[PDB]
Amino acid sequence: QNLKSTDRAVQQMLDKAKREGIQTVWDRYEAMKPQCGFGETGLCCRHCLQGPCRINPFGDEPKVGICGATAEVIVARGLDRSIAAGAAGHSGHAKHLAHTLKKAVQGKAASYMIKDRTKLHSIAKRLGIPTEGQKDEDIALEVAKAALADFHEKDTPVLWVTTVLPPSRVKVLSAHGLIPAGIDHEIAEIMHRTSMGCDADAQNLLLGGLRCSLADLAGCYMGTDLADILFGTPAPVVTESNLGVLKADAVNVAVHGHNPVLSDIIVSVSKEMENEARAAGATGINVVGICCTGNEVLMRHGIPACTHSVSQEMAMITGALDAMILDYQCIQPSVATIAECTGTTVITTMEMSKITGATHVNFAEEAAVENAKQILRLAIDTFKRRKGKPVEIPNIKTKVVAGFSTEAIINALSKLNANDPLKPLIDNVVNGNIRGVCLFAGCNNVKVPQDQNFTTIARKLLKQNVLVVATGCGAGALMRHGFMDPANVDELCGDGLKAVLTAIGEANGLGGPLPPVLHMGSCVDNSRAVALVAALANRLGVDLDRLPVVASAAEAMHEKAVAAGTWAVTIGLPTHIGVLPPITGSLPVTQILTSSVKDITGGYFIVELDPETAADKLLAAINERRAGLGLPW
Amino acid sequence: QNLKSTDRAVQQMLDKAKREGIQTVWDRYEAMKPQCGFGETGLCCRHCLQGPCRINPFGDEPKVGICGATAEVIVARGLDRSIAAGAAGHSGHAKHLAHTLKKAVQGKAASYMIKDRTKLHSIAKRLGIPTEGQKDEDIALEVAKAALADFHEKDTPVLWVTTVLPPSRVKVLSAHGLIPAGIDHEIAEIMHRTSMGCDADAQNLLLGGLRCSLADLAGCYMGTDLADILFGTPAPVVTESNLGVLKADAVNVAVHGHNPVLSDIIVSVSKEMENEARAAGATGINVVGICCTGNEVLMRHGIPACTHSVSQEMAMITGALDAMILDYQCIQPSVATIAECTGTTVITTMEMSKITGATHVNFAEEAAVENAKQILRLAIDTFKRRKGKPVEIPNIKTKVVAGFSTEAIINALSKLNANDPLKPLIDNVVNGNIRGVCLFAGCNNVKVPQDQNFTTIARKLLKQNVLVVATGCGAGALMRHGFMDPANVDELCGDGLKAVLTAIGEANGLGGPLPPVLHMGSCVDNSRAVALVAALANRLGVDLDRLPVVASAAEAMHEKAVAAGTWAVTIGLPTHIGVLPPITGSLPVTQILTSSVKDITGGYFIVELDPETAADKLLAAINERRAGLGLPW
Ligand code: SF4
Ligand code: SF4
Ligand code: FES
Ligand code: FES
Ligand SMILES: [Fe+2]
Ligand SMILES: [Fe+2]
């Protein structure tokens, strides 16, 4: 089972699933092999009913699509559509939150409110919305209206791009025509230009993709901003992760999907319903997290993380998961059929994301508490049905310190330099105690033994004194292997990095260091890493493409991960991807994405499936940035 | 060559292309056979980097996608993305026109103006924009602002849906949640819900597709509305079609693509540059049309149509095409490589639609005349280079009467009943002189011998007294085979239909009948057919799903054609498609689209590749509607 997942709790459940004849994502992968090479390489097009068209990577015909579309056009159009789909997932997420904030301050959704006034006012100031002499509710209405306005064309560009990057970076992007005009505007323009008989020049197509990736960045940053207003900016928390956070004697409820509008209410209502659960014979309601909505409630409330991404079905295989409460994105639809065998009640809540065979409970912001109680009562009913049944919860968990929003990191650093909090970090970059910064982001992928690339690469970078931050299921991978437990600093970290983590931790009243990896939150919270790096750039007076900062989507899967990798390149970062995107069928497209884009944005993709090699390439990229700043390395 | 195209001019150029070793779309199709059956059936998914996933239509594994996505989910998600892509092509087209009208009335683009005041005021009234006491420029600014506002969420739904269909139809659609909230909003929501781990219920997915198809309808109707304001509502015109409209001694300039913002200016400037062309040794500039932008200038100015859709490369093979002026959509990118062999200058004009190897001339509305002159001078240069070269223009053309906007049809009918113009048409439906109405729409497709389905089906329907209207390349197919020449009424039409066409034609001062088929314009002008049918519904006090009206996308190709077929079903029409869409790998999806959707919208798809059978099925659908109105048939 170690060839499927490096997580020992997942291995234990894979053995149980095999014993019980329950098909898993890994079994479905094996049944798909060998996968289509035209699709793997990007050399397939279905954009009109004359298709499907394919192109042989090498040899004889077919060499070109029926309409004359070349390999480079086909590959670029496919990639662009993936970027647009990822941007669309962040459009829905951020829009959901914008509408919730508007309803909250218009008196239409009393379960929601402004929890972080300071964040509200700082966002308003960043957008140019006046705050002096204004009620918070009116400031928030203006912020919500601004968020919604960034979805369409108007007299300004997308402000959740132009107000969040350094002016020098905005100027570079504007000179190449890459600033988005509107989030949904760019998504639609991609779908248009990639349709049959439209854009058919690889460079032109890929420039469009870069622009649409910035629409994805805007949606991410908007999502984080609005969630912090509504639910609070994260500060340091301690919790646990992995399947052992489930409790045989509790009603175990997983929140799974993405948006805190749902999960945050589940958390608060679950606390109100403790006695109702105890009347059913449980100890209480044990809310646990899967995927990004799990990360959201982990960061804000210390809700323990059950599992992530590719291994999500394993939480059900324990037999102890009473409900899985879903909103949208990254939910394997297999969960609805596995529920029949495992006893779990799978509940969908959003009109645009239903799964055949699941129970649907509409969740309206206006009736959030009422709807949450309905959902949780189904969970209590399900717990009652498993009275007396044996369960198999692996006794496996790790300690997780998290909650490192950018505000939290700045505050922690401020204990070393109150009026110039970024300077202690920069001081240690300059003196070599911190070699550089690496963001781990994105998914697991069934093609890669689960977590193997994240942990192999992180280990090498930490030994070389790289400050490692993580989001999404990259944070999930690292937390489940102990990388968020400060007890592992001595084993994992180079001496310079250990000295920095220790100095910061002791100045914040811990008697111990910060953890080896800083968890910066969910996938939308990749925007927090952008905020940190942009702040560093501004303090140094340079653009992001001069900073010793890199990113790694080491086990990427979702279209959202493709979009995020692309905006990482667009804002100026060397960006590793550890699975093959469908570009290898075009050398010209591959050369643009891995090389000549450096001349446009200063960033570039590093496609490398071997994680030891990827770590070396990421270190080389960091050290080249160090050299360009005249620093030793 | 008759197995490739039924057009004899195309056959002649296919022989020339073969002689000269020039590869065509048909050669590229042959080189693609056998095409992938997973793609043909819809049983392929590339929506994440764990793919590609496929499902065997029958037999053993694979049976399910890696994430658990079933065949019905995979098929529905693919179809939804196609609908969204078609909607996006109409979003770009309509948006282009909205921005042009706004610039025109803000004094920023003096080459554009309000040409149709009556249309402007009627649209304003339909939208609820006040006109009394307002300057035309302010009314137009309001209309342009309303058009742009329908792209995003606001306090009203998409008004280019809700104000153009009968209230009873709006009520049916609203009850099922199918009214779009915003054009680009729906496109993005499709891309979100179809991304990995989101919507995974076939009915839910397909309802989303129906809603997005209405966003496409809105874009079409907006495009027609705005183009009529700016360039004039069509009235009856006479011209010619097919390759013989090219002239060896003229500078032959094809306008190709979609938007009249470009082609309409080409037409007017070309007239201004006659002497400059005569100084180059030509007789003048001969502007000819390809595809929809050709239809636009045919309908408004009688510009002759050269060719359409699948046969577009053949215009170049004559050797006499000096320039091909492109904007976007349905342009085979092969044209840029064929240009090298044929001498043609291929010119792109839009930033989002470039073709490697073509010359790009930006075309800004603000500098339209200047840019048109630059483009046309390249065409004159190219004509000079072919002095003395032999050309082979097939001496083949047809006569085409066209320009039947809905306003033109109503005006023509008004000569028989001034205050109740639709009544003479309804009278003849009731008495059986007109059996029903069929709209032919959409593309040619290399899989179908060019025009064979359109002409075979049209012949059978006309003999059975069906009033036939046509748009796009369906109009192109019918015009190139004589169906728009009133001289063919006696041969083609049943006695009842002939009597009606004759009565209307003679009352409009022609001494002869209307043509056998009424050309209602470009693909966006499918919206004109909607306007006519909605007006008939309103005059009869019934919904469109009770009218004896059907549609046929007999040789469909583009994602736009899939979107149009879907909104035809959604508004209540039996809708034939003559090529296989990628749905046959899911029986549940096929059953929804061809049967159970009848219970939601009253429309349904008729998938039928044999055109004689398709004609019988369309007649059965018409006659069933007749029976439901208590009429003989
Ligand atoms: S767009 Fe071109 S390449 Fe793609 S399916 Fe259609 S004919 Fe083939
Ligand atoms: S979304 Fe599901 S079915 Fe599609 S490629 Fe990814 S794993 Fe396969
Ligand atoms: S041929 Fe396999 S992905 Fe299309
Ligand atoms: S397997 Fe051929 S279209 Fe994907
Ligand atoms: Fe996520
Ligand atoms: Fe068209």
Give the residue from B351, B378, B403 where a domain finishes: B403
* Pair B331, B197 in one domain: no
Q: Which of A61, A67, A81, A194 should be mutated for ligand 1, with most atoms under 8 A from CB?
A: A67
As a whole number of angstroms, the distance between CA B390 and CA A122 comes to: 72
Evaluate whether residue A3 is within a structural domain. Answer: no
* Pair B345, B432 in one domain: no
> Is-contact B347 B360, C-beta < 8 A?
yes
The owner of tokens 């990736």 is A213
Among B41, B103, B191, most A C-beta atoms within 10 A, so best to mutate, is B191
List phi, psi (to 5°) of B253. -125, 120
* Pair A399, A419 in one domain: no
Residue A7 half-sphere exposure, CB side, CA atoms within 13 Å? Answer: 34
As a whole number of angstroms, the distance between CA A362 and CA A359 comes to: 10
- Which pair of structure tokens corresponds to residue A349? 């809540």
* Residue whose CA lies nearest to ligand 4 atom number 3: B39
As a whole number of angstroms, the distance between CA A405 and CA A228 comes to: 10
* Pair B158, B286 in one domain: no
- Which pair of structure tokens corresponds to residue A383? 């717990």
**Closest by Cα among A53, A29, A16 to A342:** A16
Q: Please tell me what DSSP assigns to residue B334.
A: T
Please list every residue in chain B whose beta carbon sits closer than 8 Å to the beta carbon of residue A95: 153
* Pair A354, A304 in one domain: yes
* Pair B358, B461 in one domain: no
Query: How far is CA B162 from its chain centroid?
Result: 22
- First CA to last CA distance, chain A: 40
> Is-contact A162 A170, C-beta < 8 A?
yes
As a whole number of angstroms, the distance between CA B109 and CA A138 comes to: 39
Four-CA torsion A405, A408, A414, A419, nearest 10 degrees: 70
Please list every residue in chain A whose beta carbon sits closer than 8 Å to the beta carbon of residue B356: 70, 73, 200-202
CB-count burial class (<10 Å; 0-12, 13-18, 19+) for A528: buried
Evaluate whether residue B39 is within a structural domain. Answer: no
Please list every residue in chain A whose beta carbon sits closer than 8 Å to the beta carbon of residue B65: 28, 32
The owner of tokens 């409820």 is A253
Secondary structure (3-state) at B557: coil
Distance B178 CA to ligand 2 centre (A): 27
> Is-contact B517 B483, C-beta < 8 A?
yes
A62, B32: Cβ pair inside 8 Å? yes
Distance from CA of B408 to the nearest CA of A (A): 32
Query: How far is CA B169 from its chain centroid?
Result: 23
**Closest by Cα among B292, B250, B265, B289 to B387:** B250
Q: What does chain A come to in residues?
A: 633
Residue type, B22: I
* Pair A306, A200 in one domain: no
B44 lines ligand 3 (CB under 6 A): yes
Q: Which of B32, B35, B36 should be mutated for ligand 4, with most atoms under 8 A from CB?
A: B36
Evaluate whether residue B36 is within a structural domain. Answer: no
A35, B52: Cβ pair inside 8 Å? yes
As a whole number of angstroms, the distance between CA B443 and CA B475 comes to: 9
Scan residues 191-250 of B and list those with Cβ closer than 8 Å to A: 191-202, 204, 208
As a whole number of angstroms, the distance between CA A457 and CA B22 comes to: 52
**How far, CA to CA in Å, does B222 sit from each of A386, A629, B183, B353?**
58, 54, 11, 22
Total of domains in chain B: 3
Distance from CA of B48 to the nearest CA of A (A): 5
Task: Name every residue whose Cβ is closer than 8 Å to that of residue A281 and which is 6 or more positions away in sequence.
Answer: A383, A384, A387
As a whole number of angstroms, the distance between CA B545 and CA B537 comes to: 9
As a whole number of angstroms, the distance between CA A214 and CA A211 comes to: 5
Task: Name every residue whose Cβ is closer than 8 Å to that of residue A62 and which is 6 or more positions away in sequence.
Answer: A53, A54, A55, A56, B28, B31, B32
Domain region containing A330: 235-403
**Closest by Cα among A307, A221, A371 to A13:** A307
* Residue whose CA lies nearest to ligand 1 atom number 2: A67
* Structure solved via: X-ray
Give the residue from B358, B388, B403 where a domain finishes: B403
Task: Name every residue whose Cβ is closer than 8 Å to that of residue B109 and which is 6 or more positions away in sequence.
Answer: B100, B103, B365, B366, B368
Indicate the pairing of strand A398-402 with strand A237-241. Answer: antiparallel
As a whole number of angstroms, the distance between CA B95 and CA A186 comes to: 13
Evaluate whether residue B217 is within a structural domain. Answer: yes
Q: Is B445 on the interface with A (CB under 8 A)?
A: yes
**How far, CA to CA in Å, does A513 sit from each of A424, A474, A504?**
15, 21, 7
* Pair A325, A249 in one domain: yes
Evaluate whether residue B298 is within a structural domain. Answer: yes
* Pair B420, B327 in one domain: no
As a whole number of angstroms, the distance between CA B163 and CA B255 comes to: 33
* Pair B552, B608 in one domain: yes
Evaluate whether residue B32 is within a structural domain. Answer: no
As a whole number of angstroms, the distance between CA B449 and CA B3 comes to: 6
Sign of the alpha-carbon dihedral angle for B451, B452, B454, B460 = positive
Written as one string, the DSSP assignment of B87-153 is HHHHHHHHHHHHHHHHHHHTTS-TT-----HHHHHHHHHHHT---TT--HHHHHHHHHHHHHHTTS-
Query: How far is CA A457 from its chain centroid?
Result: 18
Phi-psi region of A156 (alpha: psi -120 to 50; beta: other; left: phi over 0): beta
Evaluate whether residue B444 is within a structural domain. Answer: yes
Element (H, E) at B516: none
Evaluate whether residue B89 is within a structural domain. Answer: yes
> Is-contact A90 B52, C-beta < 8 A?
no
Secondary structure (3-state) at A381: helix
* Pair B294, B153 in one domain: no
Q: Which of A32, A33, A35, A38 should be mutated for ligand 4, with most atoms under 8 A from CB?
A: A38
A43 lines ligand 4 (CB under 6 A): no
- Residue positions forming the annotated binding site of A for [Ni-4Fe-5S] cluster: 258, 292, 330, 443, 473, 523
Give the residue from A403, A438, A462 where a domain finishes: A403
B609 lines ligand 2 (CB under 6 A): no
* Pair B153, B284 in one domain: no
> Is-contact A415 A508, C-beta < 8 A?
yes
